Short mmCIF file of C-alpha atoms and ligand atoms in Angstrom, two decimals:
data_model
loop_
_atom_site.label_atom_id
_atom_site.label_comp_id
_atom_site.label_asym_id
_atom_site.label_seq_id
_atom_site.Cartn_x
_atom_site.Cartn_y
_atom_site.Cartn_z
CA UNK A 1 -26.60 -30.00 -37.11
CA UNK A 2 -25.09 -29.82 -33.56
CA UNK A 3 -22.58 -32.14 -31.95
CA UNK A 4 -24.51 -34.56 -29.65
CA UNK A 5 -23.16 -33.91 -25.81
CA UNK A 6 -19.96 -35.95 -25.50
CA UNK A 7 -20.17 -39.22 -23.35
CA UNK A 8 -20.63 -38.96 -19.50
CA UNK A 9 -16.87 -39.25 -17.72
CA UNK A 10 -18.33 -39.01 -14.12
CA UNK A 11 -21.70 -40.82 -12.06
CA UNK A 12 -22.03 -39.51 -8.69
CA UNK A 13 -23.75 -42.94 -8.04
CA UNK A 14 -21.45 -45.36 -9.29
CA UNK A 15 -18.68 -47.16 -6.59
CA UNK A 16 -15.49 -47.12 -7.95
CA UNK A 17 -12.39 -48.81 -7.24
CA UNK A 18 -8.27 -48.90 -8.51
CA UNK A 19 -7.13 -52.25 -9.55
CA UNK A 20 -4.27 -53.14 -11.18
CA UNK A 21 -5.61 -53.69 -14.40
CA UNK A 22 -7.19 -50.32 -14.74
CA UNK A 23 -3.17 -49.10 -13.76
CA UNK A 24 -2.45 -50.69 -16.74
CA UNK A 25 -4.98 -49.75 -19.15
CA UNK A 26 -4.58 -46.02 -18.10
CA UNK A 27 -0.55 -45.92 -17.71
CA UNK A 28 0.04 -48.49 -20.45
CA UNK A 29 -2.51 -49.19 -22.82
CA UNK A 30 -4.24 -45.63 -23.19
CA UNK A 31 -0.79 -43.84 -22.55
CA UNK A 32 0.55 -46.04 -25.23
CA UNK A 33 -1.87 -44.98 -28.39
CA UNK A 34 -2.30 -41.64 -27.07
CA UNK A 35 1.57 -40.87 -27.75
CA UNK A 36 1.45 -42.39 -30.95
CA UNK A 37 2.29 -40.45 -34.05
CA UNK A 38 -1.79 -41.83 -34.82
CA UNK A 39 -3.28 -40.60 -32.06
CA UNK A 40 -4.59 -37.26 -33.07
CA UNK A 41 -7.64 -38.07 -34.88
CA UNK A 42 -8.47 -40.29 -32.23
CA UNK A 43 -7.84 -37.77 -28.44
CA UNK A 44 -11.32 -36.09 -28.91
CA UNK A 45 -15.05 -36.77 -29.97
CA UNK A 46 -15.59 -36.04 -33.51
CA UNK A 47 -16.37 -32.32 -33.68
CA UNK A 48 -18.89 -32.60 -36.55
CA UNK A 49 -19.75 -28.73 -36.78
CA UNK A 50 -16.33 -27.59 -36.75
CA UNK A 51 -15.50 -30.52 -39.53
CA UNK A 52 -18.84 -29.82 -41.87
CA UNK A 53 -19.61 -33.98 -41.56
CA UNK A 54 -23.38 -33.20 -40.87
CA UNK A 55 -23.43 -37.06 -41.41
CA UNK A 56 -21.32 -38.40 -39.27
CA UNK A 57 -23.87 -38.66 -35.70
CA UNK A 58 -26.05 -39.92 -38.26
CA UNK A 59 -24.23 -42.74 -39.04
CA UNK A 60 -22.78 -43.48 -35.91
CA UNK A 61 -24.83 -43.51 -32.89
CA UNK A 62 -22.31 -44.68 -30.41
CA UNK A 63 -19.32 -42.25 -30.40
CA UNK A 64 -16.36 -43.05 -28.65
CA UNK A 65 -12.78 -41.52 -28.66
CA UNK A 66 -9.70 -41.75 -26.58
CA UNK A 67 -10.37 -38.32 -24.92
CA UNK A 68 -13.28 -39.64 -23.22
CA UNK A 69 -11.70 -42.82 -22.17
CA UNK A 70 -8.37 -41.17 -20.89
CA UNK A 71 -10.99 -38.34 -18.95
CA UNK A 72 -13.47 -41.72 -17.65
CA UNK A 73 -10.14 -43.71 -16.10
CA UNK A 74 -8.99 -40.77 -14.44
CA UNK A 75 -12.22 -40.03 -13.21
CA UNK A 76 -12.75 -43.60 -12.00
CA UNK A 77 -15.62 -44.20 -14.35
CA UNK A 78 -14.61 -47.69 -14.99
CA UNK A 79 -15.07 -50.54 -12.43
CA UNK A 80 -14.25 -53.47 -14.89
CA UNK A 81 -11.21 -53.80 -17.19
CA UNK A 82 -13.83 -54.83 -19.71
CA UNK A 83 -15.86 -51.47 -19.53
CA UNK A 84 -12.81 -49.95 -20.67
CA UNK A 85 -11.75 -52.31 -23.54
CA UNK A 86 -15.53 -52.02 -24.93
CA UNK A 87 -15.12 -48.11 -25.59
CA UNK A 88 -11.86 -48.77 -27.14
CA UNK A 89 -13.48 -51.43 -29.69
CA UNK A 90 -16.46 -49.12 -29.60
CA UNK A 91 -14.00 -46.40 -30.99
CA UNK A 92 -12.48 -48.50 -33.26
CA UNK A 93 -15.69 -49.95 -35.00
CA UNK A 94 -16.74 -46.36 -35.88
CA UNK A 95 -13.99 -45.30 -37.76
CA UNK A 96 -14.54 -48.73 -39.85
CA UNK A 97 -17.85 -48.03 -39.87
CA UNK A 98 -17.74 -44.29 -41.49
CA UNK A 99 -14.69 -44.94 -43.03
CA UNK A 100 -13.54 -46.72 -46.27
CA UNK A 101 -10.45 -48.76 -47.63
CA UNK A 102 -7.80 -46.45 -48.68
CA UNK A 103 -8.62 -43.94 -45.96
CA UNK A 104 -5.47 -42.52 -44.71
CA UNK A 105 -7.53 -42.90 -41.24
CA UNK A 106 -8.59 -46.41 -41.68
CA UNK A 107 -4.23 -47.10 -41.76
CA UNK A 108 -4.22 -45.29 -38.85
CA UNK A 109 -6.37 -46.98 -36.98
CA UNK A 110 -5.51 -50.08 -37.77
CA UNK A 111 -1.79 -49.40 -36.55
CA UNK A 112 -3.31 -48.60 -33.30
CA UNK A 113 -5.16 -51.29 -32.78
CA UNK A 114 -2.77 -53.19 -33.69
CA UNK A 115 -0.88 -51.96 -30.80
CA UNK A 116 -3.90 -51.82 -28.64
CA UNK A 117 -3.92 -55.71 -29.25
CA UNK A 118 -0.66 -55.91 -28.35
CA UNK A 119 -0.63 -54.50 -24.88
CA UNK A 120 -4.15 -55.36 -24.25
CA UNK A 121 -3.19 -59.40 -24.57
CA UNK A 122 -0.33 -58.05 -21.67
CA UNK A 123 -3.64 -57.52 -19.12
CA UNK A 124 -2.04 -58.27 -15.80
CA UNK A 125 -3.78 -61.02 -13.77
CA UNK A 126 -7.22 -60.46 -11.54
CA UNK A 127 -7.36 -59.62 -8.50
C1 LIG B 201 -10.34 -33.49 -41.40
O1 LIG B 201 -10.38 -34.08 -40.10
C2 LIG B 201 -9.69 -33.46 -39.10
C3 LIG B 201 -8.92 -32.32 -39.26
C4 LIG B 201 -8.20 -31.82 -38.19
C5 LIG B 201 -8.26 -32.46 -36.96
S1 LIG B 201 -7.49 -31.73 -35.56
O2 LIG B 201 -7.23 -32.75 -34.59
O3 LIG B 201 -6.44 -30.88 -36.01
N1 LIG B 201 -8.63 -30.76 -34.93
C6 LIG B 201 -9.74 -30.94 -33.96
C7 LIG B 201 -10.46 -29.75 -34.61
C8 LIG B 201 -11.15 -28.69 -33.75
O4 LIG B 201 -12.46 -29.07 -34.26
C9 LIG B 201 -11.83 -29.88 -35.28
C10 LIG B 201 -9.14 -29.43 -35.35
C11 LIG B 201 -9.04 -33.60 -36.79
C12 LIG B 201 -9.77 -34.09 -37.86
N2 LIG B 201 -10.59 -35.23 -37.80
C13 LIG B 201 -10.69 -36.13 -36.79
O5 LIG B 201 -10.24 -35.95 -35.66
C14 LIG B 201 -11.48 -37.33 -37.08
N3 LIG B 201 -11.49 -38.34 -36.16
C15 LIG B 201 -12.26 -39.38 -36.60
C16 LIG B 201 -12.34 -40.65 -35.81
C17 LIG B 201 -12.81 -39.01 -37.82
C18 LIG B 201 -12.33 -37.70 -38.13
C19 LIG B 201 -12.81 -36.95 -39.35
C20 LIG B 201 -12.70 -37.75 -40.65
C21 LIG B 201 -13.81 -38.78 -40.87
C22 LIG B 201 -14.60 -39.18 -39.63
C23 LIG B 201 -13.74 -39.85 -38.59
O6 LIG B 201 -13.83 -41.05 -38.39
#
C-alpha cells in the first residue's frame, strides 16, 4: 500500500495575512519542538512504505506532522492562529491513537506537547 499524498501546504485561492501570532507559532512554538531532541519522528508525514506499517493510513485518516505545518506557515497557509494549533493537536492525537503505553514514541510525544502547551498558553494578544 502507497503513502496517501501528503497534506496541501499552498491554495492559490486562499487570502493570507502575517499577524503576530502566526510570528509566534512559526518562530517560537514550531521552532521550539522542531529543535527538540523529540522532534525527529515528528518533521515528516509518516512514510508508511519505507516503514512496512501497511496499517498505519488505515488507522489514521487524518495525518498530520510538523513538516507540513512548518512548510503551511511559511507558505502562508494559515489565516487563524487556531488553524495552526488544530494540526498540531491533530498530530498529536495520531500518535495516541496508533500508539500504545510504553511506546518509547508515546514519551516522546508527550514531552512535546508538553512544551507545545507551554508556549502555546504564551499566544501573544489579537490583533
Ligand atoms: C521506526 O520508525 C522510524 C525509523 C526511522 C525514522 S527516520 O526519521 O530516521 N526516517 C524517515 C525515514 C525515511 O522513510 C523513513 C527514515 C522515523 C521513524 N518513524 C517515524 O518517523 C514515526 N513517526 C510517527 C508519528 C510514527 C512513526 C513510526 C512508528 C509508529 C507510527 C508513528 O506514530
Amino acid at each position: 500500500s502507497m503513502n496517501p499524498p501528503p497534506p496541501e501546504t499552498s491554495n492559490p485561492n486562499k487570502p493570507k495575512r502575517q499577524t503576530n501570532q502566526l510570528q509566534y507559532l512559526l518562530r517560537v512554538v514550531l521552532k521550539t519542538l522542531w529543535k527538540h531532541q523529540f522532534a525527529w519522528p515528528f518533521q515528516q508525514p509518516v512514510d508508511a512504505v519505507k516503514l512496512n506499517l501497511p496499517d498505519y493510513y488505515k488507522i489514521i485518516k487524518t495525518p498530520m506532522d510538523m513538516g507540513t505545518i512548518k512548510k503551511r506557515l511559511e507558505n502562508n497557509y494559515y489565516w487563524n492562529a487556531q488553524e495552526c494549533i488544530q494540526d498540531f493537536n491533530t498530530m498529536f492525537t495520531n500518535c495516541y491513537i496508533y500508539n500504545k503505553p510504553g511506546d518509547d514514541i508515546v514519551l516522546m510525544a508527550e514531552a512535546l506537547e508538553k512544551l507545545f502547551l507551554q508556549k502555546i498558553n504564551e499566544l501573544p494578544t489579537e490583533e
